[PDB]
PDB file of C-alpha atoms in Angstrom:
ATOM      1  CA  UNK A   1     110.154  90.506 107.859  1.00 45.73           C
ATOM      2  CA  UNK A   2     113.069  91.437 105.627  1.00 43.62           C
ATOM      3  CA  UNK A   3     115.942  89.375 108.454  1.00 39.70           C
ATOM      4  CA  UNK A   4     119.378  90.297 107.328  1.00 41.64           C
ATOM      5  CA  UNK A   5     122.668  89.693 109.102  1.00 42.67           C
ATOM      6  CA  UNK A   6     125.177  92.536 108.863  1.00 46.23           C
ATOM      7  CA  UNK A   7     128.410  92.859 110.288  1.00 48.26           C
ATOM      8  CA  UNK A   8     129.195  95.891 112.298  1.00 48.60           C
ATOM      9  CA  UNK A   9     131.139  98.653 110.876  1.00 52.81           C
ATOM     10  CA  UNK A  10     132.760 100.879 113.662  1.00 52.59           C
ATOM     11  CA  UNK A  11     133.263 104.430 113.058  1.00 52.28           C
ATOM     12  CA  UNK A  12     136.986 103.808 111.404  1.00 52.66           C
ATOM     13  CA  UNK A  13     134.291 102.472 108.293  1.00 55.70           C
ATOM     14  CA  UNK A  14     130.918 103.945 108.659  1.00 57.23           C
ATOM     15  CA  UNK A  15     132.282 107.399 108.857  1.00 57.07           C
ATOM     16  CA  UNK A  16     134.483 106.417 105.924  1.00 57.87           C
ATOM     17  CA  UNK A  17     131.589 106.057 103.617  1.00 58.61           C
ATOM     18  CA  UNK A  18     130.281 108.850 104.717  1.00 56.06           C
ATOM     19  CA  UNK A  19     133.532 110.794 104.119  1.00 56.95           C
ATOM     20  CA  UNK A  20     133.360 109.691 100.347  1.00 58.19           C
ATOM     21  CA  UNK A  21     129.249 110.574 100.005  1.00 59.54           C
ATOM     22  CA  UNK A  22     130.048 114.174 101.627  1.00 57.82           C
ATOM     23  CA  UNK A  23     132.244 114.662  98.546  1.00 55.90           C
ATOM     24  CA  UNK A  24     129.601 113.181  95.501  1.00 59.45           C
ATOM     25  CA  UNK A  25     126.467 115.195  96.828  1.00 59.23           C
ATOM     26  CA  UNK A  26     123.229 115.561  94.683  1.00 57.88           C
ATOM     27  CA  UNK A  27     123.985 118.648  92.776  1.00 58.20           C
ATOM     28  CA  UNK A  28     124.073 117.636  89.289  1.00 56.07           C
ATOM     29  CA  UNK A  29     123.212 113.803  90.032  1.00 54.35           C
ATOM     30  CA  UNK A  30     120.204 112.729  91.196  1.00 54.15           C
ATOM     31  CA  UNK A  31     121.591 109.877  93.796  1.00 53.37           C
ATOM     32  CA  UNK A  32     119.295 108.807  96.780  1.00 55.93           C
ATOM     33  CA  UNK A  33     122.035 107.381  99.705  1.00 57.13           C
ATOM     34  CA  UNK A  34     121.333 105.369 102.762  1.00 55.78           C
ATOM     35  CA  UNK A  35     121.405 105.931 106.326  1.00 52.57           C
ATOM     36  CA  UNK A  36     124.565 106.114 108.172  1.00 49.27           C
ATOM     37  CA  UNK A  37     123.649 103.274 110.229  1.00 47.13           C
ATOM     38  CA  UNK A  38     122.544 101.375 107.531  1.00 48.62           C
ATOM     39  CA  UNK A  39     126.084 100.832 105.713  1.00 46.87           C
ATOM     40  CA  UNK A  40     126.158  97.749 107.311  1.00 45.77           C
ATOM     41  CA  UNK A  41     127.967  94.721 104.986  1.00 46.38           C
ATOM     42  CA  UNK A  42     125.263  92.673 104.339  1.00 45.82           C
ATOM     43  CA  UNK A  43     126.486  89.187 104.935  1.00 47.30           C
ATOM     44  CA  UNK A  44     123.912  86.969 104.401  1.00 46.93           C
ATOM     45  CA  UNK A  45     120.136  88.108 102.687  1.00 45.13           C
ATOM     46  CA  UNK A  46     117.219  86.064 104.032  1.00 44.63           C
ATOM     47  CA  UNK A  47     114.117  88.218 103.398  1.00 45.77           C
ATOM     48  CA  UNK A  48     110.878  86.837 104.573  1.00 46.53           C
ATOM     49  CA  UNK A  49     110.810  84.720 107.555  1.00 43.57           C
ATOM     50  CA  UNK A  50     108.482  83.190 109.914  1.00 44.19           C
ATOM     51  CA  UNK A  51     108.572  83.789 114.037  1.00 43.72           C
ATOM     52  CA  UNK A  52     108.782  80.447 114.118  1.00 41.24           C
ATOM     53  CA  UNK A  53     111.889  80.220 112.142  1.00 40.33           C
ATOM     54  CA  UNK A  54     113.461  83.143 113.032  1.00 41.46           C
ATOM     55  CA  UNK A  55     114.661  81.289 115.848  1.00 41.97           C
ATOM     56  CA  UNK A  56     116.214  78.464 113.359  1.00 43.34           C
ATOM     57  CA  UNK A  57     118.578  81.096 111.769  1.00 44.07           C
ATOM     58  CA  UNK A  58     119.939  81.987 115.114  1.00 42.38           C
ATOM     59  CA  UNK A  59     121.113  78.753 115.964  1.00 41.02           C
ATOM     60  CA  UNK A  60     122.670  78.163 112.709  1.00 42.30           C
ATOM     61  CA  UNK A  61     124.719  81.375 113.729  1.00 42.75           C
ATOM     62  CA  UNK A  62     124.940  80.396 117.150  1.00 43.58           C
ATOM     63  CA  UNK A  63     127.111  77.670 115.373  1.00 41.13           C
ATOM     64  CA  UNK A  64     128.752  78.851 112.059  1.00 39.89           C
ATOM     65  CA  UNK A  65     129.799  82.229 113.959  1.00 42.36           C
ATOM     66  CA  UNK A  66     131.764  79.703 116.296  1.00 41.19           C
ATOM     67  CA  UNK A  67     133.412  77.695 113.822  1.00 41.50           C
ATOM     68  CA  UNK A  68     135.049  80.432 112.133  1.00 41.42           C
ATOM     69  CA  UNK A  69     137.385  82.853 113.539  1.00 37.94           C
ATOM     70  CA  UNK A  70     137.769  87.009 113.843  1.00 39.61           C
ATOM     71  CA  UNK A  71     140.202  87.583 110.832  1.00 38.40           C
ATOM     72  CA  UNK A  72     141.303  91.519 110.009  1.00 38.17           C
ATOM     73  CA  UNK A  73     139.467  92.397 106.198  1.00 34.04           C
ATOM     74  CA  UNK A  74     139.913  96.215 105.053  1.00 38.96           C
ATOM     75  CA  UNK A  75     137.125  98.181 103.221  1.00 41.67           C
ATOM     76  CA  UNK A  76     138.580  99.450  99.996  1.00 42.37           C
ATOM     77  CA  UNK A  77     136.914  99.742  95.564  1.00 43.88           C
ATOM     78  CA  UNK A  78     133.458 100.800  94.963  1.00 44.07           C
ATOM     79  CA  UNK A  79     131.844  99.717  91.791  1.00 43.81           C
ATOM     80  CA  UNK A  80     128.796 100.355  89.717  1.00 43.77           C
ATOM     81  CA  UNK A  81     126.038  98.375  87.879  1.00 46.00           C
ATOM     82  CA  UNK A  82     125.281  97.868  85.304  1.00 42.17           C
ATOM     83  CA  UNK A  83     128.445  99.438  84.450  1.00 40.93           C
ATOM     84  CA  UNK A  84     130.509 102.684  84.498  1.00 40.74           C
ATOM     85  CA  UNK A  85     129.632 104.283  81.222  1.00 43.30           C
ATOM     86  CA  UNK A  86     125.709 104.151  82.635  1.00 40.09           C
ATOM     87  CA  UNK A  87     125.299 103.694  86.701  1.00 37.34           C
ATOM     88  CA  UNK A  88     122.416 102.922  87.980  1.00 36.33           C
ATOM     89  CA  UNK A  89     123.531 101.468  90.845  1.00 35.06           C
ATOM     90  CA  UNK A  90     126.284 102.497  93.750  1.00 35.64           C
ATOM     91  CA  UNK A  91     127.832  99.784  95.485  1.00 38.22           C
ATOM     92  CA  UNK A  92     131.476  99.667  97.349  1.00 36.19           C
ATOM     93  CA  UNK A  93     133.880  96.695  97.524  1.00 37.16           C
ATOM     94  CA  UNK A  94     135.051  94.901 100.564  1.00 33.20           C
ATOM     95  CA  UNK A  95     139.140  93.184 100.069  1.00 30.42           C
ATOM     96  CA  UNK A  96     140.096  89.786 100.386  1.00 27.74           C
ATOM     97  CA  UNK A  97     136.989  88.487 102.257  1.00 30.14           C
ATOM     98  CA  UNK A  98     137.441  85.068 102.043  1.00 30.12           C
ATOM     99  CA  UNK A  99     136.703  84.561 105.341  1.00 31.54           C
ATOM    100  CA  UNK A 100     133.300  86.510 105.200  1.00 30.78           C
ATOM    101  CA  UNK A 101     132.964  84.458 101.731  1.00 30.12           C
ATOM    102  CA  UNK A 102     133.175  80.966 102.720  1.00 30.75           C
ATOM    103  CA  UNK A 103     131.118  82.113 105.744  1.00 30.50           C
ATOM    104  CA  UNK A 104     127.969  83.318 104.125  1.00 35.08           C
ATOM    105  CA  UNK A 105     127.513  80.474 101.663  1.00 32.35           C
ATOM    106  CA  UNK A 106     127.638  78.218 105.224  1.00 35.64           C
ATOM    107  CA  UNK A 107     125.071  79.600 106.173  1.00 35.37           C
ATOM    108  CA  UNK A 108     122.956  79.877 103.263  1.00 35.24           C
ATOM    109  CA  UNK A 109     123.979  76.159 102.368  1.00 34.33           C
ATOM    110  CA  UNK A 110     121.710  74.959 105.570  1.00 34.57           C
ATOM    111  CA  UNK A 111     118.672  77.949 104.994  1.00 31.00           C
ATOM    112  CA  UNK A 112     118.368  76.165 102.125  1.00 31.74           C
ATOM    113  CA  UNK A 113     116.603  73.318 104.106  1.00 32.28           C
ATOM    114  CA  UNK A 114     114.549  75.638 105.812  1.00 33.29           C
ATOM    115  CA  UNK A 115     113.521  76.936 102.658  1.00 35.86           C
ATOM    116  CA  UNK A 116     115.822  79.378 101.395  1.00 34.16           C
ATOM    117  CA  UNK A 117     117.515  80.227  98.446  1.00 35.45           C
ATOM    118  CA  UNK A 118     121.005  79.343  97.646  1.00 35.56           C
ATOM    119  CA  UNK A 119     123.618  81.824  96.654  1.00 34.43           C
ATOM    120  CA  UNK A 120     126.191  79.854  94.274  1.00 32.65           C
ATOM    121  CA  UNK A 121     129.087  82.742  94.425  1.00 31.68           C
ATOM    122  CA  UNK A 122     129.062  85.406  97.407  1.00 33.66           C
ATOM    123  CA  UNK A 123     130.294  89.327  96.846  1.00 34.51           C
ATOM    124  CA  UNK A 124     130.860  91.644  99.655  1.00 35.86           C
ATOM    125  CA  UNK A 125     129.461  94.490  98.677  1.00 38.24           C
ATOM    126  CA  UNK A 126     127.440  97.868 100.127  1.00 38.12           C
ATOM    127  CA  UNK A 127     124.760  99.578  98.425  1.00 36.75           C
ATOM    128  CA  UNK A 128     125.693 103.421  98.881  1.00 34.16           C
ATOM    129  CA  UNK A 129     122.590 104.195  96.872  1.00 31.62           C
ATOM    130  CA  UNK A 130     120.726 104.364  93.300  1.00 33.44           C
ATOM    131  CA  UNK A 131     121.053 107.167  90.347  1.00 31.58           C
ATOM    132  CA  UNK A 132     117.872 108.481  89.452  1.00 32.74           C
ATOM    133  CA  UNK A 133     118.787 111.029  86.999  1.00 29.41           C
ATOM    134  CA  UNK A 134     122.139 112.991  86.382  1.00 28.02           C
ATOM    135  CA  UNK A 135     122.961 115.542  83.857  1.00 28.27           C
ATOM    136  CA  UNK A 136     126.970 116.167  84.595  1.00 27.88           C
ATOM    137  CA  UNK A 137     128.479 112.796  83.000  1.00 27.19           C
ATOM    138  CA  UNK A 138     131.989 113.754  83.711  1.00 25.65           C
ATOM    139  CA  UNK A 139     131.362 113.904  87.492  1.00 26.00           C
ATOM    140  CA  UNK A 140     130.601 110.708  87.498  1.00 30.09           C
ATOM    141  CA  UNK A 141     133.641 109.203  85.941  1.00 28.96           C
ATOM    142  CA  UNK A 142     136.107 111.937  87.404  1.00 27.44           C
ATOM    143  CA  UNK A 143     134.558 111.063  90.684  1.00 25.18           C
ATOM    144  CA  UNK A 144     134.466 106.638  90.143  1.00 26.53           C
ATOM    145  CA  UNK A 145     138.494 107.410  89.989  1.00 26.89           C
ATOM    146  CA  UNK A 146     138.668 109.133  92.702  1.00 27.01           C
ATOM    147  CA  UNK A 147     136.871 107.236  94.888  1.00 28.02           C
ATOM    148  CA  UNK A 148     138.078 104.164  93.295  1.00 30.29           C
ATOM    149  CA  UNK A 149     141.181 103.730  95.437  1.00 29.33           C
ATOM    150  CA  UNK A 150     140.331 105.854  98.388  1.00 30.73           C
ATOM    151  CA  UNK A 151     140.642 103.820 101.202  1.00 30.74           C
ATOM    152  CA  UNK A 152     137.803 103.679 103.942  1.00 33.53           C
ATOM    153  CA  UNK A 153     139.720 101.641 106.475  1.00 35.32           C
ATOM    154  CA  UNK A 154     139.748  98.202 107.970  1.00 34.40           C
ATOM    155  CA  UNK A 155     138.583  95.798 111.517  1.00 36.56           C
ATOM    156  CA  UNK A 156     137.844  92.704 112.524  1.00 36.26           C
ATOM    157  CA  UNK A 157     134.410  90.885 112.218  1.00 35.52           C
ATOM    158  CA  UNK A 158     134.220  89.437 115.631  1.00 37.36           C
ATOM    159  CA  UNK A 159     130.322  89.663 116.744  1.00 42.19           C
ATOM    160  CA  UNK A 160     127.458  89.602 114.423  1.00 41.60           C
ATOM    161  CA  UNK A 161     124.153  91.723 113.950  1.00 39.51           C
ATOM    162  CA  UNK A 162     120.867  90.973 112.902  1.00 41.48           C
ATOM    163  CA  UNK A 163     118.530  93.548 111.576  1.00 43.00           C
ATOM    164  CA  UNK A 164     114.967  93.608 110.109  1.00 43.74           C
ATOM    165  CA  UNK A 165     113.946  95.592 107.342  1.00 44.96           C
ATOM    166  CA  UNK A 166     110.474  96.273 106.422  1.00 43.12           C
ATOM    167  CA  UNK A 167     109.024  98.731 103.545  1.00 43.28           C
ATOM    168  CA  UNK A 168     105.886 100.624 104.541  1.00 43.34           C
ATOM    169  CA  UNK A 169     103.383 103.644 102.821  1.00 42.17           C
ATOM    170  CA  UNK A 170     104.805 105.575 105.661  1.00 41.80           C
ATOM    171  CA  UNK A 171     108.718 104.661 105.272  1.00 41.39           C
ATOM    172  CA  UNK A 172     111.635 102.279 105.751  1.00 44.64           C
ATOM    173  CA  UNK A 173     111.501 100.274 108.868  1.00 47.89           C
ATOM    174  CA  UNK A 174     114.185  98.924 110.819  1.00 50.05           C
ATOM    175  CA  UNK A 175     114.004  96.642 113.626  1.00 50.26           C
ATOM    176  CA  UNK A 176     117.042  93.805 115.464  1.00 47.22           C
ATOM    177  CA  UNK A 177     115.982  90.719 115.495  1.00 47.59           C
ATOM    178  CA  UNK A 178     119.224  89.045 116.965  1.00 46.66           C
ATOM    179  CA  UNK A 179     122.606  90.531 118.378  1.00 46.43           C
ATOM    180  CA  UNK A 180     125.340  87.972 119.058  1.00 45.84           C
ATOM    181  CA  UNK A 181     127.587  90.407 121.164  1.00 47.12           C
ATOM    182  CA  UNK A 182     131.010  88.447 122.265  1.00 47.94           C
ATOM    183  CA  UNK A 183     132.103  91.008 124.684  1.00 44.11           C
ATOM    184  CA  UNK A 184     130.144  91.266 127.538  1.00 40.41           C
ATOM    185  CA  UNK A 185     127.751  94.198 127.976  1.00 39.32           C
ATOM    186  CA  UNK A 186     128.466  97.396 128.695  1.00 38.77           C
ATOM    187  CA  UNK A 187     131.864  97.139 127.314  1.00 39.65           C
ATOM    188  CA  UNK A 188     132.271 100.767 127.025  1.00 43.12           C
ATOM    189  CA  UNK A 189     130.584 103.955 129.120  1.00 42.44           C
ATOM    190  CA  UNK A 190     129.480 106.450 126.157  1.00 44.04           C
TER     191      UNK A 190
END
């Protein structure tokens, strides 16, 4: 019952990523990425939940989501853990998310009666994936650079997603749990 709220990142974005991973592959690096549908921004991690209060988290959204407004953030920076010289870790950088900042510390701030834990400072940030073993060092650098300043593009965080993510023997799971859609339904005919 790993519950996670994401924001949704139209093509403009999730292609974007994509367009940067294309260009690393796993030749010389060992680097495991993640689904193309699973670049969502993770805005606020709650991890294990109960049916019971699954329903509590929605509300708070129901609320929070409709205090704050749809402001225009771009998707730009990647960094590394624990730092460039050895990654272990691939992450990109959202810009000035200040909006999406004061936004997922709101709603932590209340999980943390329900029994949650409280997340002091807030980064915007996407796992792209994690190094197991490289032997090209160069690569890595030359590429960090590269990628550094490409841009991925921008939108507007308007509706929110919920999505569950659950580790089995068999594989990754990945279920919704809530979709706050503003638009109505069947916005567009694909």
């Amino acid at each position: 019952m790993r519950a996670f709220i994401a924001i949704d990142v139209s093509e403009s974005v999730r292609d974007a990523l994509v367009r940067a991973q294309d260009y690393i592959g796993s030749k010389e690096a060992k680097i495991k990425f993640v689904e193309r549908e699973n670049f969502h921004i993770t805005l606020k991690f709650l991890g294990e939940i109960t049916e019971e209060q699954a329903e509590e988290i929605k509300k708070i959204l129901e609320k929070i989501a409709k205090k704050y407004k749809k402001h225009e953030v771009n998707v730009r920076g990647i960094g590394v853990f624990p730092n460039p010289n050895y990654v272990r870790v691939i992450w990109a950088g959202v810009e000035n998310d200040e909006i999406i900042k004061k936004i997922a510390k709101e709603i932590d701030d209340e999980l943390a009666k329900l029994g949650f834990k409280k997340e002091g400072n807030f980064v915007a940030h996407i796992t792209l994936g994690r190094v197991k073993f490289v032997k090209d060092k160069l690569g890595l650098a030359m590429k960090l650079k590269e990628l550094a300043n490409e841009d991925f593009g921008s939108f507007i965080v308007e509706a929110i997603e919920l999505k569950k993510s659950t580790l089995t023997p068999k594989g990754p799971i990945y279920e919704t749990l809530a979709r706050f859609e503003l638009s109505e339904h069947h916005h567009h005919h694909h």
